[PDB]
Amino acid sequence: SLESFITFFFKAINRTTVRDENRIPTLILNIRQTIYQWISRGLFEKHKLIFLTLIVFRLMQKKIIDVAYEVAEMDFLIKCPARPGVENTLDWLPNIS
Amino acid sequence: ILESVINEDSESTIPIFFILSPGSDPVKEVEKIAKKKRIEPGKNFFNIALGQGQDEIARRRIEEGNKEGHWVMLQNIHLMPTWLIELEKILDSYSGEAGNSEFRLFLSAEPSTGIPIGILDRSIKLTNEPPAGLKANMKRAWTYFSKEEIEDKDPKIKSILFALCFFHSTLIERRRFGPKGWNMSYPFNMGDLRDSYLVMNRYMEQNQGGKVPFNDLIYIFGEIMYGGHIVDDWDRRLCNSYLFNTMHEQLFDELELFPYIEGKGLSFKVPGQNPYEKYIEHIETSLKQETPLAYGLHPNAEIGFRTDQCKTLFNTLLELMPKEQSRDIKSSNEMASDLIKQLLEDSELKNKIFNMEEIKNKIDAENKGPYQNVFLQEIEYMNALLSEIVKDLEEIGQGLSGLLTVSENMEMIIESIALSRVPASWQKLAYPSKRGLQSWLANLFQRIEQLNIFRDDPYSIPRVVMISRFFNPQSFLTAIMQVISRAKAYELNKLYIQTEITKRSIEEIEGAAKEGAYVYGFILEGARWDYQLGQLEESKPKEMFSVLPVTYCKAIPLPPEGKEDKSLYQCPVYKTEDRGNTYVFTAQLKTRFPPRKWILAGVAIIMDVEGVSD
Amino acid sequence: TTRLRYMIDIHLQRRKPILFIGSAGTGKTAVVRDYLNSTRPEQVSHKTINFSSFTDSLALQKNIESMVEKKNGRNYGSATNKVLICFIDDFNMPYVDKYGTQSPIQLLRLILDYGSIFNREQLEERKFLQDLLFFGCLNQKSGSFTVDLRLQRNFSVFSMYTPSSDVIKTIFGSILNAHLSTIDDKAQKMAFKLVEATYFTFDKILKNTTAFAPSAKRFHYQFNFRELARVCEGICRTTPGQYSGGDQGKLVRLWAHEMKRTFEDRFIANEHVEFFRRYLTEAISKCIGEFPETENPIAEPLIFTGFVAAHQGLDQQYTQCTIPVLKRVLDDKLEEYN
Amino acid sequence: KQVFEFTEYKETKTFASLDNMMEVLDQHSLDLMGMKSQGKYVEFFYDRVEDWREKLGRVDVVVNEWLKVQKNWKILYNIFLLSEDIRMQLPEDTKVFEGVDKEFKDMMSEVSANPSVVEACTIERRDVLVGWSQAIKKCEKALNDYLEQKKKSFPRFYFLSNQSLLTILSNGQNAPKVCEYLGDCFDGLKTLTFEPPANPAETSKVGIGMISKDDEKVPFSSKFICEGAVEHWLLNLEFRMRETLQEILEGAKNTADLWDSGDKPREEWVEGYNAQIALLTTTIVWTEDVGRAFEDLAGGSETAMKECQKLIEVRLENLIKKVRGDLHILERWKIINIITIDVHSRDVVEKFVIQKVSEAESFAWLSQLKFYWENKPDSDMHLRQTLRFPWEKDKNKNKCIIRIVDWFRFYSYEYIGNAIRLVITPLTDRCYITLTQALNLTMGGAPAGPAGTGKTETTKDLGRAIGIPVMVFNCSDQMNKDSMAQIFMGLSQSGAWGCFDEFNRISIEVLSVVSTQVKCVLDALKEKKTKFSFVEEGEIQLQDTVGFFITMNPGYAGRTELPENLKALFRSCAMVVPDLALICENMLMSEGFTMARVLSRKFVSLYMLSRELLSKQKHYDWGLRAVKSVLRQAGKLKRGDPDMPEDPLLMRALRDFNMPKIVTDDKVIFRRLIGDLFPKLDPPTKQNPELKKIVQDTTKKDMGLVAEELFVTKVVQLAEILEVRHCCFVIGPPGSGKTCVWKTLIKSYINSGEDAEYDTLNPKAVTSDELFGAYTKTKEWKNGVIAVIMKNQVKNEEKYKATHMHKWSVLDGDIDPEWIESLNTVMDDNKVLTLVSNDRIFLTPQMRLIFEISNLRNATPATVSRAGVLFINETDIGWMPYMNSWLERSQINILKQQKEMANMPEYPVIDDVAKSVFY
Numbered sequence A: 001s002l003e004s005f006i007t008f009f010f011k012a013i014n015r016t017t018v019r020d021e022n023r024i025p026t027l028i029l030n031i032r033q034t035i036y037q038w039i040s041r042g043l044f045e046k047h048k049l050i051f052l053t054l055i056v057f058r059l060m061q062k063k064i065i066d067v068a069y070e071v072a073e074m075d076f077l078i079k080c081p082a083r084p085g086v087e088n089t090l091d092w093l094p095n096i097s
Numbered sequence B: 001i002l003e004s005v006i007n008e009d010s011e012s013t014i015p016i017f018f019i020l021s022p023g024s025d026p027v028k029e030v031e032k033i034a035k036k037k038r039i040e041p042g043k044n045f046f047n048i049a050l051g052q053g054q055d056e057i058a059r060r061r062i063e064e065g066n067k068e069g070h071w072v073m074l075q076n077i078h079l080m081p082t083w084l085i086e087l088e089k090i091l092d093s094y095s096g097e098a099g100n101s102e103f104r105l106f107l108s109a110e111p112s113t114g115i116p117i118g119i120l121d122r123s124i125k126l127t128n129e130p131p132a133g134l135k136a137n138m139k140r141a142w143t144y145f146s147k148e149e150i151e152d153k154d155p156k157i158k159s160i161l162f163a164l165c166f167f168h169s170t171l172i173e174r175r176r177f178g179p180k181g182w183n184m185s186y187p188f189n190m191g192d193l194r195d196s197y198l199v200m201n202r203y204m205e206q207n208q209g210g211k212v213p214f215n216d217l218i219y220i221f222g223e224i225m226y227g228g229h230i231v232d233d234w235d236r237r238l239c240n241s242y243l244f245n246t247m248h249e250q251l252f253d254e255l256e257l258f259p260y261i262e263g264k265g266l267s268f269k270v271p272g273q274n275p276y277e278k279y280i281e282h283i284e285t286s287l288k289q290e291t292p293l294a295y296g297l298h299p300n301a302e303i304g305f306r307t308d309q310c311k312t313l314f315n316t317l318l319e320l321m322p323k324e325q326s327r328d329i330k331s332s333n334e335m336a337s338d339l340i341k342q343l344l345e346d347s348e349l350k351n352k353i354f355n356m357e358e359i360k361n362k363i364d365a366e367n368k369g370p371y372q373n374v375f376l377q378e379i380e381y382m383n384a385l386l387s388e389i390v391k392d393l394e395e396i397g398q399g400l401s402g403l404l405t406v407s408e409n410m411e412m413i414i415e416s417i418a419l420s421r422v423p424a425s426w427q428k429l430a431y432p433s434k435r436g437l438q439s440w441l442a443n444l445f446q447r448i449e450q451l452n453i454f455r456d457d458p459y460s461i462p463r464v465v466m467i468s469r470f471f472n473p474q475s476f477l478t479a480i481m482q483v484i485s486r487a488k489a490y491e492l493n494k495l496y497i498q499t500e501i502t503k504r505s506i507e508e509i510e511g512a513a514k515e516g517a518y519v520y521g522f523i524l525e526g527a528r529w530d531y532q533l534g535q536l537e538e539s540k541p542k543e544m545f546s547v548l549p550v551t552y553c554k555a556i557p558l559p560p561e562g563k564e565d566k567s568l569y570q571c572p573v574y575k576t577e578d579r580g581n582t583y584v585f586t587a588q589l590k591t592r593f594p595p596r597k598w599i600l601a602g603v604a605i606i607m608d609v610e611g612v613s614d
Numbered sequence C: 001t002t003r004l005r006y007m008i009d010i011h012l013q014r015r016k017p018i019l020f021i022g023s024a025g026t027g028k029t030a031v032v033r034d035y036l037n038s039t040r041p042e043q044v045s046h047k048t049i050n051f052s053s054f055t056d057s058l059a060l061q062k063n064i065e066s067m068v069e070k071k072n073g074r075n076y077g078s079a080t081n082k083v084l085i086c087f088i089d090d091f092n093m094p095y096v097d098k099y100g101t102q103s104p105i106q107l108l109r110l111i112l113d114y115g116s117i118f119n120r121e122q123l124e125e126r127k128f129l130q131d132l133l134f135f136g137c138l139n140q141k142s143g144s145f146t147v148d149l150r151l152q153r154n155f156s157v158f159s160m161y162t163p164s165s166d167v168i169k170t171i172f173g174s175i176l177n178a179h180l181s182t183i184d185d186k187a188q189k190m191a192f193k194l195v196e197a198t199y200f201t202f203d204k205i206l207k208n209t210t211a212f213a214p215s216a217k218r219f220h221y222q223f224n225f226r227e228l229a230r231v232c233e234g235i236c237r238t239t240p241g242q243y244s245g246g247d248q249g250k251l252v253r254l255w256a257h258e259m260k261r262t263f264e265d266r267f268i269a270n271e272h273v274e275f276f277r278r279y280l281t282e283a284i285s286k287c288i289g290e291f292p293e294t295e296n297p298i299a300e301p302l303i304f305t306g307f308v309a310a311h312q313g314l315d316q317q318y319t320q321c322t323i324p325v326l327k328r329v330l331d332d333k334l335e336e337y338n
Numbered sequence D: 001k002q003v004f005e006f007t008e009y010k011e012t013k014t015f016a017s018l019d020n021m022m023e024v025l026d027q028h029s030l031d032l033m034g035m036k037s038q039g040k041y042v043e044f045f046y047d048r049v050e051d052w053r054e055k056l057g058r059v060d061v062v063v064n065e066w067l068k069v070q071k072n073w074k075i076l077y078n079i080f081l082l083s084e085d086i087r088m089q090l091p092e093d094t095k096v097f098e099g100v101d102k103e104f105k106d107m108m109s110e111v112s113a114n115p116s117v118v119e120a121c122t123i124e125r126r127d128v129l130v131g132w133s134q135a136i137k138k139c140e141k142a143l144n145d146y147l148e149q150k151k152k153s154f155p156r157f158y159f160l161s162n163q164s165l166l167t168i169l170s171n172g173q174n175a176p177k178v179c180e181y182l183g184d185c186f187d188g189l190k191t192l193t194f195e196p197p198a199n200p201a202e203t204s205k206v207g208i209g210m211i212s213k214d215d216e217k218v219p220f221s222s223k224f225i226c227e228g229a230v231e232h233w234l235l236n237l238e239f240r241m242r243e244t245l246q247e248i249l250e251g252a253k254n255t256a257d258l259w260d261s262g263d264k265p266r267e268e269w270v271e272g273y274n275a276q277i278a279l280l281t282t283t284i285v286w287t288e289d290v291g292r293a294f295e296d297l298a299g300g301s302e303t304a305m306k307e308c309q310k311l312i313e314v315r316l317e318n319l320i321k322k323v324r325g326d327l328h329i330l331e332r333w334k335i336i337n338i339i340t341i342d343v344h345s346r347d348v349v350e351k352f353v354i355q356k357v358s359e360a361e362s363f364a365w366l367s368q369l370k371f372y373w374e375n376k377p378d379s380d381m382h383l384r385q386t387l388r389f390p391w392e393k394d395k396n397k398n399k400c401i402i403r404i405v406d407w408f409r410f411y412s413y414e415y416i417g418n419a420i421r422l423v424i425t426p427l428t429d430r431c432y433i434t435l436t437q438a439l440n441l442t443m444g445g446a447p448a449g450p451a452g453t454g455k456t457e458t459t460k461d462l463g464r465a466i467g468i469p470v471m472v473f474n475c476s477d478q479m480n481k482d483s484m485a486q487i488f489m490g491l492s493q494s495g496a497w498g499c500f501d502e503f504n505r506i507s508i509e510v511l512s513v514v515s516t517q518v519k520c521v522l523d524a525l526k527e528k529k530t531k532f533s534f535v536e537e538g539e540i541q542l543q544d545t546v547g548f549f550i551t552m553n554p555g556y557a558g559r560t561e562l563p564e565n566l567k568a569l570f571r572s573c574a575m576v577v578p579d580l581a582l583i584c585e586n587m588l589m590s591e592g593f594t595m596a597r598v599l600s601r602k603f604v605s606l607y608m609l610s611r612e613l614l615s616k617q618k619h620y621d622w623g624l625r626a627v628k629s630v631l632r633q634a635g636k637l638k639r640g641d642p643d644m645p646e647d648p649l650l651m652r653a654l655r656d657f658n659m660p661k662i663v664t665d666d667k668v669i670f671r672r673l674i675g676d677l678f679p680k681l682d683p684p685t686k687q688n689p690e691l692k693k694i695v696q697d698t699t700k701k702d703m704g705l706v707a708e709e710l711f712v713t714k715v716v717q718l719a720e721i722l723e724v725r726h727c728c729f730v731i732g733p734p735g736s737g738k739t740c741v742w743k744t745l746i747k748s749y750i751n752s753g754e755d756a757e758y759d760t761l762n763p764k765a766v767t768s769d770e771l772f773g774a775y776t777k778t779k780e781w782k783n784g785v786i787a788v789i790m791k792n793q794v795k796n797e798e799k800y801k802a803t804h805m806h807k808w809s810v811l812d813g814d815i816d817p818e819w820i821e822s823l824n825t826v827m828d829d830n831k832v833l834t835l836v837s838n839d840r841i842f843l844t845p846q847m848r849l850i851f852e853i854s855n856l857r858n859a860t861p862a863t864v865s866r867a868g869v870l871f872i873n874e875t876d877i878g879w880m881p882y883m884n885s886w887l888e889r890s891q892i893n894i895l896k897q898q899k900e901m902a903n904m905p906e907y908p909v910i911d912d913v914a915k916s917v918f919y
């Protein structure tokens, strides 16, 4: 629900004990933790990993945290297309690799 | 977590949703926590279980619960889909009213479709998954069996029960591996293990001092106890291996449950006669670390799982990845479809299509062969594929650059190209082998190449054929047998195809050998076929798949009676890596090790592994 | 037409039916419709049937029942040994089901071979049909592409070919020459030029298949004879007395306008319009040869109407009207309408 | 001015045909009420429409009220009617009801005097009617309670429908009417034979014998008299069925030992006794025989297993000759069911010799379903199950026991009456193991497989071998807690195996009850208590012999996942499609082939290879249904020439019947493919010379077409197909002479025997509903075009079956699944026609159906199987025969001579010089 998410989001704000020293930074950090732990409980073991990969890639996409990447390279990371053409490989390296 | 989550959030109006897996009970954990928070004798709070007719009692309990303020636990919520639509309406009315403070509604249900979206939304979700491991699974198997029943039973019967617990445990760990493992997903419950014990228990009480029959008991475990799950019958032979290795005369003496363990250094054995409490302690210590090798799989078979695991996490993450970066300058789906279209239009696809009339006219039809019949049927299927994909391509290519109505299936093809998944309509045509879109096109042109060499001198069969690149491999095998039946003087039905692995490479110009048919493009998984030895052996650790050399395929009459050879191992061949109802024929190959080892390892042949040169 | 006309006379003497195939433009219906008029009403009795894609097998029988008189016994035929011809148009256009076979068409096959039709009222009665002939007229790329091969076998196939320079010039050239000769002894040579021009424009559009073709959103774009025919019709509307004199400047303007108003309206996109105007100028400049560059032969301002004449007290006069004159007439007439 | 005529119901005037008025009244209420309120002009005069609308509304309530009372009153009154037995039982309600019926008969007569029923009904009358209906309901509730007591008394009544139950209780005196509905309760025992009574008015009580569903008579030892209470004499009958089966078996087994050494053959002994008892006694002396072979091999005689093999294989052959020589259809299966068990028996001993198992009490022997006829002096059978019948408790007379993998339970003697035993296969043997172990552990057994497996049929045939009754239930998601509980309550009371068809499609709500109900029964079986306590109606008789079987389909659409609690109770078994070799082997042994086994493995292999190498055609049927129809033809030809060997005969049959269906491209490969199987054997083409000669002569004389060697072969092939198959498909390409081929055949039959009328129509052309015929707005049924030809062809028309040897109705439309569905009853082997009117028409053996189609793409694969197909290759007929007929003008000349087409154009005279140029 939108409504349930809104109550968890607000709860995260009320849990913050910082008094305007570094509230704005610590609040963001506390929200992420608060929302993630709620959803993780809701998720199965196999999916819990998948959801954490999103959150970081979505923070990277929007550039909320500073990371060294390229938009084309993130599209290549999510889906790698196998390109034929070169027959010459190394013995140890697989043909698929 | 459950003690924390109730107190910290969902005080009122937000009911708590539990999702339970088989062998897990949410009610046992909540009741303990429930007692510490407030006085809960079972009067104040009611743990109402949802049954038919008890829907009115639950409605009365939840209605009473709101004005009173005591929390109410409901179980087996999925069992009544009509009442959830009714319940939803009651929760919406009570959210607007806002009955008594410190009231909650706990609901627990197996995950299923046709659960109302509204309830799942408003409610907090909490999942409880049991620890996943061979040891953790063996432990859960012994906890299920009542302490006071196992103590009563004598050392002989409890020792063989142990070996069964392991057998049940190892099957759940195989389910985690896709092709290399089972080849199919089958449901296994504790009730199917309990069932098997109760039968075993009776057989020991009858025999008494007289020696127990394993031969009688093992059939039951393979054909009945875990036969009921397996329909395919290839998995059944694998299922019997585990069983045959676990259950034998020497089981009652300390013996390794894991197969062979020649130079593996696990040294995990069945516990000797001792008190029940000592059985669990020994289980926990001796299992210690859980590896693929324990089940009979190769180490590379675990690496291959992390590969299959890794791949799924990115196929999901692709769907989840939102807004497609929100623009900005990456090529659009319709651009990417146009680019692939241009590459296909650059190639002479219309030229690659083979007119049936021209090829039939080249053949005299008096000197025609069974081989010639198979190719003619094969090229027809290819023509029907190649015409369809060119039609779908020239249509979608026209729709991009030309003002025309865009059909729903054509939008899906554009979407499938961007994703680089093989299209659904294309996949249905020709071979069922999953690949990348760029890999498929490269593979398709190698199929087309095999038909081009056929069109020139059709009457003269090529010295080396490639069964890896046919629409039906089986069809070709029936053909090679037909040619032998004309040359020889017995029934075709009697002749069975028998593969023999050859040390010669493609270089050899010798072809059309009397009572023979050459093959190549066979790939062996879960093992390595050494050329020098001339036998199947354990795989190289880092090499996942081992390509076979030139395969010679002879037809010879079946044996009069069922004959079992230790040297010969029967491995199935599959068209795709998936190995799910793509069985073609049983190939035979010579192995110094026992067959039991290889059926347990799961070793099979695959036609297309994407480890094909050029 | 003359050689097909001979083939029909051959096929009418025999009980063999005829089937005509070709595009919407080809002019098949008219070639049959001409013949049915020229045939003697005692020897042969003609009737037209047109399917709008809701014509059920029962509705076709009601049309056949009415056409056929009641002979002695169960047999039904025309009295005094008259041969009965039923003309069918848009043969494939009746609605096709899931199964790809048309209920109204399949009925006709039962009639051709067995010669017995079961009436929905009194289904026990055989109701045998005799001395019946069926003349098909089938448009390809329309409704069902092809009809059932077992019916098509009973019919002798014939094709009308698409319009040609030699075919168009002989048809329209003879209509215009007969009308333009009554207008003025001069401007006969201008008639032939206009026929080659209208063809030239028509031909340059067919050549550009990418630009203009049949499609989902181009169901109408299809360029027939009818648009050439109504263009040729609207010239024939022009009275002699007003167009008397030098027709080097006045006719080409009229033609160009009328041509433009049956092609512009066909086009949806302003891109297609631009392409057409270029072909129309090239066409005019070729057949005319020398024309003044001062005043464009075709222009958006240029309109022709025979209602402006009626306001000014001229009788059956169709000429170019200026934009400001048009304003005054419409505004006055609107007050009369109110 | 509207009205309601009273139709006497002997003796109550009734409102019949009210609905026609009712619908008109509803239409008047609809538009009339809405128009008055909505219309501004209508609003001014509303004081009129509203009063009229209220009157129209009043009419409907009173009209629904008699219908709700008359139908229910009719039913309860009919329970009281002619039931003094049931009248005396509940006096308080019977009297109250009789009071209400007489009142109702009077009120209806008074109404037939009054005008509009609603106007007559008023309000007070409506209230009185509602009170009377409530009083009648009370009677139904009282009667329902009485039915439950009767249901507790007899287990079979629960299975029987309440409408049937009521009928039986009403006609408790009339014995022959009761015996009619025992066919629904039992697997066999359709009715009972009876001694003609003393006074002809009375119906007989004295039962001398029982009659099966197939009319097999089992004579009772002495006279069986029907006592008073219907439940009490039926429960005495239920036991007298068993008693008589038991009494014969003791005689059967004594004569069984005697025939072995005796001069009288086995096959002759099988004839004398009944299909059930014969098959059991076969299996009993098979198990004794095998048991004597094991004891010898303990002695050391290697040949003991080989001789037991040899003996079993000689009786199989000797019985195979008996099915070939003309027999009685009842005696067929009485003998063929034995063929299906003795083939398995032979496969068992083959399997024992190959694996080299020389010990008794090996698993391999314990696995097989063994039947033992022994008075065990140390009887453990009193512990393993509960002793029910007298003979089980006697312990002085040999009882029949059934042993299989540590599950030993007595042969319950239910009467099945020669229903066909399924072919035994290594999967069904394995399946029997799973189900028996489930019962051994007192829990349910569930087989899960794909559609067409016929798992329900295997579970039935298992219980049939045991001789316990088997009941089949089908669930359409209308099953309730109460309706389901009654079945379980009834099943527990009387020892009976419950098999649930499409159990998967059950509401997850009602399923969670079933799990609790089943759990309570299973919990009682583990305790093994003689009596148990159900959730409602606690005190019910329990029997250990009862077992619950549920058949799930994983692939079925709208599947609901079973609860984990229920899944743990029912042991899952894996089910696969039965192997085509093992079914074909039985069908071949049914026709009497000595080498059937060897041929079957060869036959199946052909068909499996044929699908792969031949081009995919829709008209080709490679299914089991097509195989049987090819074998049945081969079987008549086998019976004709038994002395000829089997392999050469089969060769000729397979080629002959498949050639027509097969196209020219596939004819060359298929002929060469056949050569693989029988390379040494040389096939001789068989053609009837009399039929070929008359066809050639008729085609030159009156058809004026050239009798081409390819053409005449197709006509002869069609004529054969019409003889074997009642329904045939003359498929072909768009432009050939498909029509000419069937037309030539008729004119040949006319010259051969007598004139042959044919009714040609196009089904596709005419609307599917109008062809078959449907009800109009007015309650009157019009005869369909197909439906009238079926009435006309039987009698009172030109096509009447009086002087015509062979008639057939021709159809030349494109086959569709909607259109054929209405005709799918006629398509099937059973010659039954279904219509919307429900008028029953039976297709005569001399009636045939010929369908003529261009493409069989719209048709379903099942539809192609149902009938015998014939493909005519365009190149084989050609266009030359038309051209030759045109140049000769013989075709044209004949049409002008003999047609109603008087106005036909005269064709020109062709010169001998002109003909030779044109040709």
Ligand SMILES: Nc1ncnc2c1ncn2[C@@H]1O[C@H](COP(=O)(O)OP(=O)(O)OP(=O)(O)O)[C@@H](O)[C@H]1O
Binding pocket: C150, D705, D706, D707, D708, D711, D732, D733, D734, D735, D736, D737, D738, D739, D740, D741, D812, D852, D853, D854, D879, D880, D881, D882, D883, D884, D885
């Ligand atoms: N032996 C023959 N020689 C020449 N012409 C023949 C011969 N037999 C039949 N014909 C003609 O060939 C045509 C066959 O007509 P028919 O209706 O059987 O064709 P069909 O294509 O099977 O029809 P449908 O599509 O309606 O099933 C007729 O003109 C018939 O008279």
Ligand SMILES: Nc1ncnc2c1ncn2[C@@H]1O[C@H](COP(=O)(O)OP(=O)(O)O)[C@@H](O)[C@H]1O
Binding pocket: C023, C024, C025, C026, C027, C028, C029, C030, C031, C137, C139, C171, C224, C225, C226, C229
């Ligand atoms: N000689 C002619 N003079 C005028 N119009 C003709 C002539 N021949 C054919 N047509 C045209 O033929 C059309 C009617 O017949 P046809 O084109 O076959 O109809 P349809 O396109 O509906 O099949 C009209 O456009 C008519 O003008």
Ligand SMILES: [Mg+2]
Binding pocket: C029, C030, C089
């Ligand atoms: Mg027209």
Ligand SMILES: [Mg+2]
Binding pocket: C113, C150, D739
């Ligand atoms: Mg025909």
